[PDB]
Amino acid sequence: SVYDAAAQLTADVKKDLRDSWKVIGSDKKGNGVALMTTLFADNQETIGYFKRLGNVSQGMANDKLRGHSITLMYALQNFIDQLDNPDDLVCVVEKFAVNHITRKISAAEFGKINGPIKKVLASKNFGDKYANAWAKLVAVVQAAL
Amino acid sequence: SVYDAAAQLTADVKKDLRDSWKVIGSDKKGNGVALMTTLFADNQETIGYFKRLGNVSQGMANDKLRGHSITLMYALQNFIDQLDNPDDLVCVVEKFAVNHITRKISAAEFGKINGPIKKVLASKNFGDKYANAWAKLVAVVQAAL
Numbered sequence: 105s106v107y108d109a110a111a112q113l114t115a116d117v118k119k120d121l122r123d124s125w126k127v128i129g130s131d132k133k134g135n136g137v138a139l140m141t142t143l144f145a146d147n148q149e150t151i152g153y154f155k156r157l158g159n160v161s162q163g164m165a166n167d168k169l170r171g172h173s174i175t176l177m178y179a180l181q182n183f184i185d186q187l188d189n190p191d192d193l194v195c196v197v198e199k200f201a202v203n204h205i206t207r208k209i210s211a212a213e214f215g216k217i218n219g220p221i222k223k224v225l226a227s228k229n230f231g232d233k234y235a236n237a238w239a240k241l242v243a244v245v246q247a248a249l
Numbered sequence: 250s251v252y253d254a255a256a257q258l259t260a261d262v263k264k265d266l267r268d269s270w271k272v273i274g275s276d277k278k279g280n281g282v283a284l285m286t287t288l289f290a291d292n293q294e295t296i297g298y299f300k301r302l303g304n305v306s307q308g309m310a311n312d313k314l315r316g317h318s319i320t321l322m323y324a325l326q327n328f329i330d331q332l333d334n335p336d337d338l339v340c341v342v343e344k345f346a347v348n349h350i351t352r353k354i355s356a357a358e359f360g361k362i363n364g365p366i367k368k369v370l371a372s373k374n375f376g377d378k379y380a381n382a383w384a385k386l387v388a389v390v391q392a393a394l
């Protein structure tokens with residue numbers, strides 16, 4: 105159950121999550137766009153799922169693309185603000201889960217964001233330790249899918 | 250025009266939005282739910298627009314309500330973090346506007362949030378001045394609908 109996954113995150117994991125976010129979270133626009141671009145380069149099989157953002161090949165030049173990147177970056181903020189409160193975290197996750205459930209975004213498909221995240225983290229000098237911690241947070245969302 | 254409305258966010262209004270947000274921003278969950286409850290009490294003809302939310306009359310108790318309440322509060326935060334860059338502000342508003350357009354929410358309906366906000370602000374000791382400043386920000390989204 106979602107609650108089980110949320111209550112999982114330990115003090116160590118929660119600490120590493122906030123520690124890294126403090127950086128990658130400082131530039132949601134610059135960092136958010138990078139994550140989206142990376143996911144499009146490594147996972148070209150997900151480009152059609154964003155036919156709304158038009159030509160994701162534009163990057164920062166794409167108005168729609170930027171909107172999603174910036175908006176997506178904020179989505180993570182909400183999860184990073186409800187780490188000390190499983191009750192709240194679950195409610196927040198379940199909400200965002202609805203939008204993903206209607207988009208036919210299976211748990212496996214959602215796990216595709218792990219590749220890009222790890223890259224964006226390494227670019228800042230965040231070894232796996234941090235990459236693994238982020239994976240745990242992502243799992244919480246998959247549990248609701 | 251979105252570009253026109255956003256151009257109404259002078260330095261004075263920008264400062265007022267941040268000065269107030271700092272307070273109401275401290276409690277997105279507590280304040281978020283309050284805004285929703287006040288909106289459902291002052292505007293009953295807007296309850297059917299949240300069928301998925303289930304029983305709103307439940308208040309904080311309702312998990313679905315809190316989830317959308319906390320998430321909604323974050324939406325405002327994103328808009329405040331873009332007050333510096335008009336270009337980015339629009340890209341964010343347009344993105345959120347698309348969600349209201351597909352929901353059948355016209356400028357009129359949306360504008361139904363000015364009442365609650367004004368009430369929530371007063372409870373914190375923020376007269377009109379602040380209530381009006383927020384109206385300008387809300388207007389930007391109203392022009393994208």
Ligand code: HEM
Nearest residue numbers: 150153154156175176179180203207213214215216217348
């Ligand atoms: C860190 C992980 C992720 C976060 C925080 C996230 C967050 C978001 C948010 C906040 C939205 C807007 C929801 C709406 O307004 O309906 C969204 C939309 C969307 N996301 Fe998830 N997402 C993530 C991963 C993914 C992945 C891995 C995929 C696909 C493989 C995906 C596919 C989509 C699509 C297709 C949309 C709709 C875009 C549009 O048409 O506006 N996302 N995402």
Ligand code: HEM
Nearest residue numbers: 203295298299301317320321324325348352358359361362
């Ligand atoms: C400050 C003003 C508001 C903000 C920042 C805001 C923000 C949000 C956000 C971020 C969402 C989630 C979008 C998604 O995942 O699709 C949402 C959903 C929604 N909003 Fe707006 N909203 C505002 C005012 C209103 C008003 C006044 C109405 C109706 C009169 C409204 C109707 C809805 C509905 C029906 C949903 C979908 C709820 C659900 O089924 O989960 N919103 N809002």
